[PDB]
Design a binder for this molecule. Sequence first.
Ligand SMILES: *[C@@H](O)[C@@H]1CCC(=O)NCCCCC[C@@H](c2cccc(Cl)c2)OC(=O)N[C@@H](CC(C)C)C(=O)N1
Ligand SMILES: [Cl-]
Ligand SMILES: [Cl-]
Length: 166
Amino acid sequence: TLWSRVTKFGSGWGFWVSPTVFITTTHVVPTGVKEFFGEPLSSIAIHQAGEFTQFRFSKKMRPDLTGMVLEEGCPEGTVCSVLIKRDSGELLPLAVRMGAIASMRIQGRLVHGQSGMLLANAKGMDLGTIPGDCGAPYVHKRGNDWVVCGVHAAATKSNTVVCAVQ
Ligand SMILES: *[C@@H](O)[C@@H]1CCC(=O)NCCCCC[C@@H](c2cccc(Cl)c2)OC(=O)N[C@@H](CC(C)C)C(=O)N1
Ligand SMILES: [Cl-]
Ligand SMILES: [Cl-]
């Protein structure tokens, strides 16, 4: 069910935190549209800053899901999994050790987020390092309660990643 939250969106992915809250990276979001997921813009509260986008829908969009904890990044040193899917729906998690919060200009856009380091398989598949992989969530486990703390925004050709954080 965790992976059923990861949804193809625009030029990447996003993540359902709850039935009404969807997060993604700003640069993958469609532009010049009258709706997202069939809902009018009048029924969505949208907040975008520092390459983090949050949609709060007035209607229950993903009632199949429970709510989980969304936090604004994680402590330095946390090991997260980036829940990358590819177009088949295949599940390809990327393990990352997270570093410090900062704001970094990457290809003209300011990313407010956390850099991290990837922990040969990933490279063979360009995991995290193709445009279609952005928006995937960074998660870690607190007991058996899952915490999402960012969205994939950037990564070097070849092993630093950046997730945008609220
Ligand atoms: C998702 O859209 C994509 C994932 C990262 C990716 O595709 N990397 C392969 C291309 C790498 C180009 C360089 C990197 C970069 C530059 C400087 C610092 C860092 Cl850590 C990474 O460019 C990006 O990652 N740029 C991302 C889009 C920006 C608007 C944030 C990007 O391509 N993300
Ligand atoms: Cl879940
Ligand atoms: Cl910007």
